[PDB]
Symmetry: D2
Subunit: 250 residues, 4 copies
């Protein structure tokens, strides 16, 4: 029987690359998405064309709220419903936007989105994954630049730091169950659709190893390593995949 | 005119020692409290007996909610109302209890643990900066964030987030001359709520004297960071842990 | 045409497992050794039985001295003489013993051995490796997951391993324009000494959250193989803990 | 009655400022120096004019060699010879220059100077200080930029990383003797005339807090705190005094 994985925010970009590589490795996949329904369905269609009945989509908002625990439980339930097991959880979904300290969304909403997606949803997903339970593991998508953060991104940075804390705490606590918990920390990988080429190039020029951003596949490669049998003693580790960006002084 | 400081969770224990030392150093102080009204007022009475009209109290729940931003704005406003200025913010108040991953609702635990340790510090930081000399913020962190207590994930998440706030706010508020630093205790003032067996077990782990920190020793590092002797220091977290975090399993 | 790797301290234990896995992956290997000649040669003979002319040995003391730079240049040169190329360097060789700060080796010898093997030799080997490269080139340094929670009375050892982290970062930064990646693997508790009492071994094993056991040499080698692979080609300046969670455990 | 301190590389710049502040605080001081004999003797004269018999100079090369242990023992011995006690050791002396990995000093000399001054001499001085033994402590001058080093400074950076390791290891091991071991990590401070004006200006503009370097006195202020009674539970801590420099991404 093939193992099964949940990847959050998997419709596009890094999440899609992770889902694709897991699928190529032989996993059945739950493609979680929030707004990108067409892209999620397009991906699931492609994966099911390769191997029938090996991909499903699952919609959920991962903003913090009193129903978030139930939503996260349902994402894990959806993997069991489709595939009868859940071996791997990848916490990839993430809100990212500035929240300046000095001056449409209310600050309450910004907290709920930035802390919810980057930290609280991963925590609740981790609880539900563990409660339901071989090579079991969780991979959290972190950020290599958390100690040298983008200016005016405090709430986002708080969220990613909290995710490091979760990775460590959950690795410690879930080790007796044989559930490994690790992270992959990109530097600059895919730049946003909205960003102009000149701004993209400004970031690219900072990277020592090739003056280019990580491909989505390069990020996925590290995730696949951590979920593999080649990482079976690794827990509580966060692997930077940043081309040396974090080593470069101001 | 004397500078003024807000200390959250200042009625007891480390917060109280911080408020006392700031006041002894010459600050006027806002003593924030949640449940400990009697102790907050007793502290204010003590400090005001030393110097009239130099200590006030301010009540607020720092749990995350729809009203937390307003509560935090009002804590900062209370300092400006009482004293006409706010030079120092100490983010000390903190919920701390286990939240096991496998088996209050969990969402209430998120609100309390992440609210007190991270979101309230952020909102207080925003309000402090917006309302603006030796201005600074000190966040009470945790020397054991990378070797956390078992089954304290949400607490540990909150303290990690507070490290991130310390760094992000240091970076962003530096142009305004506002420094942002942290003090990271190991074990300090182990409470009655711990058993004597657990208390001795922790104390014996501490390389420097096999004892916990006093609240005053924690306060000493806060006083340094707000002082003129720290005017180039921002984004720094000082462990006050007697070497505890250096000790392997 | 097959790539080539130098592994220092490759006769036994973790270095041996790394050399074996690299060879299984398709590398030709230089098996460096200091005192363990019989084991280095037995490994080479095993690997050459698998594929002829794919393993050589190279003897050197990696203690710090005025001749260390020449010794390290010669190790790298040996790979070029054997195989015509040198694609991977693994800095594994390491002295490890206590050096108490307070009350038969002299302290200058302990400095030389502990700082030489763990830090200075890796630096000189890195220099020589890079100079010959003035494709998937990379260096892997064997670090230590417990450098911030060190064994009592191991100051010089711990200094050496911290220095090795600094080399990893500095060399990653500087060698990036040459396409040479520089990374680390940081064991927690892996192979214990055979002569250590099982009761003492078990004291260490019981500390490890993930399985209450030490890492095998092969599990350490798995992380090295990942870092030198095509699946790690954007990774430089990273140190992967392979510690079963040990470093997360408070006192 | 008055406690005594050894400060290495104390003739000039940051070491001088540390020696002056310790002296103003009530310490008797050993002013160690290597080449700066005239400055060392002038400083001792200044401090002795303020309080007689409270300062001496001590010359030593702190380059690694087989005689370095004897030299370090002699520096501590010089404190006992002059003052009858040695309460504080400040490891400040430091060689700093590039050592590129790819191509008048030989590489062995570069290793000896950079690793000796920044790491091995601090270790040997720490040994001798501890063996010869209240508020006893050691302060190591570290570097806030150890994880974002200057390009082509590998040996220097290795030395400073080793000094972090010593700070931790010695804090752990010397705690039972009541000796605290801490560090102060500058970013940019008191940029020297020898540095080109253009390079000085470039580094100053990187610093978030005031777009300026630290004065020597600001560095010394952190050393004074760590040796004081207000730091009596602090050991194994390294305090950045960097104006936020280390927080700034490339
Ligand atoms: N790209 C980089 O340079 C970079 C750098 C450092 C770290 N990372 C990390 O790597 C991961 C992948 O990066 P990325 O650039 O591919 O991410 P991204 O495009 O910014 O976001 C990934 C997905 O997150 C989902 N998401 C956002 N808000 C959500 C919410 N409220 N509820 C549920 N899902 C939500 C979105 O799903 P829908 O589209 O379905 O709405 C989105 O497609 C993230 O964790 C990111 O922080 C990336
Ligand atoms: N003690 C230690 O060993 C230790 C170790 C590591 C870190 N620290 C950090 O050092 C700081 C001080 O420690 P401590 O032991 O003195 O703290 P504490 O006694 O656990 O808590 C301090 C105060 O926090 C306030 N607080 C708790 N929940 C709150 C809420 N929902 N809203 C508003 N205020 C709330 C309480 O105020 P009221 O009493 O008025 O309700 C309480 O008196 C904390 O940030 C702690 O995390 C302490
Ligand atoms: N084992 C663990 O639990 C553990 C934990 C943390 C980190 N590590 C790291 O992982 C690596 C491998 O560990 P290990 O236990 O396999 O190492 P090890 O057995 O202690 O030593 C490996 C080899 O180092 C060589 N070596 C020692 N001194 C030398 C010198 N002066 N010159 C040249 N070579 C010298 C020896 O080669 P010869 O036998 O030929 O003389 C020895 O076989 C080391 O870097 C170690 O620090 C291991
Ligand atoms: N300045 C900064 O921006 C900065 C930044 C980061 C870290 N730091 C650290 O802060 C400390 C003070 O910095 P600084 O700029 O004042 O240092 P510095 O001027 O570069 O050097 C301090 C003293 O080190 C002594 N020294 C050099 N080589 C020696 C040797 N072989 N043997 C004995 N002593 C030797 C010299 O003494 P003589 O003159 O008597 O020969 C020199 O005056 C150093 O540890 C430095 O690494 C400084
Ligand atoms: C510094 O400013 C910016 C930087 C970047 N960098 C690339 C980028 C893209 C998507 C991302 N998405 C998430 N989930 N998290 C990130 N960390 C992230 C990053 C790092 C993207 C921006 O646009 C969204 C931006 O704002 C203009
Ligand atoms: C592991 O279990 C426990 C550990 C401790 N340790 C001391 C202690 C006390 C108060 C604290 N209060 C806050 N805000 N944060 C902390 N970090 C903290 C700590 C660290 C105290 C306990 O009782 C309060 C306890 O539960 C029985
Ligand atoms: C703390 O005491 C000890 C601990 C260990 N632990 C396992 C072990 C074995 C070989 C090692 N070899 C090197 N190169 N570096 C290490 N880090 C290392 C370690 C970590 C091995 C000991 O004996 C060699 C020992 O001494 C009794
Ligand atoms: C990257 O190039 C350079 C950088 C700097 N930076 C300031 C500076 C000055 C003295 C220093 N001295 C020591 N002991 N350690 C340092 N860390 C140090 C630094 C950090 C100074 C230079 O000239 C003195 C220089 O060379 C041109």
């Amino acid at each position: 029987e093939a193992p099964a994985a949940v990847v959050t925010g998997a419709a596009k970009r890094i999440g899609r690359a992770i889902a694709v590589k897991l699928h190529q490795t032989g996993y059945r996949v739950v493609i979680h998405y929030h707004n990108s329904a067409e892209a999620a369905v397009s991906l699931a269609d492609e994966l099911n064309k390769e191997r029938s009945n090996t991909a499903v989509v699952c919609q959920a908002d991962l903003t913090n709220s009193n129903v978030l625990p139930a939503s996260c439980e349902e994402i894990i339930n959806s993997c069991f419903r489709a595939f009868g097991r859940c071996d791997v959880l990848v916490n990839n979904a993430s809100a990212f936007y500035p929240t300046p300290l000095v001056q449409g969304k209310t600050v309450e909403t910004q907290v709920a989105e930035l802390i919810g997606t980057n930290a609280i949803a991963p925590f609740l997903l981790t609880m539900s994954f563990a409660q339901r339970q071989s090579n079991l593991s969780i991979v959290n998508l972190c950020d290599a630049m958390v100690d040298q953060p983008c200016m005016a991104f405090s709430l986002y940075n708080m969220g990613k730091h909290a995710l490091v804390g979760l990775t460590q705490s959950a690795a410690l606590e879930l080790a007796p169950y044989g559930i490994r918990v690790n992270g992959v920390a990109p530097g600059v990988s895919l730049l946003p659709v909205a960003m102009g080429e000149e701004e993209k190039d400004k970031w690219r020029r900072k990277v020592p190893l090739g003056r280019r951003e990580a491909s989505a596949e390069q990020i996925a490669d590290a995730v696949i390593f951590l979920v593999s049998g080649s990482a079976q003693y690794i827990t509580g580790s966060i692997i930077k995949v940043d081309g040396g960006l974090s080593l470069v002084h101001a």
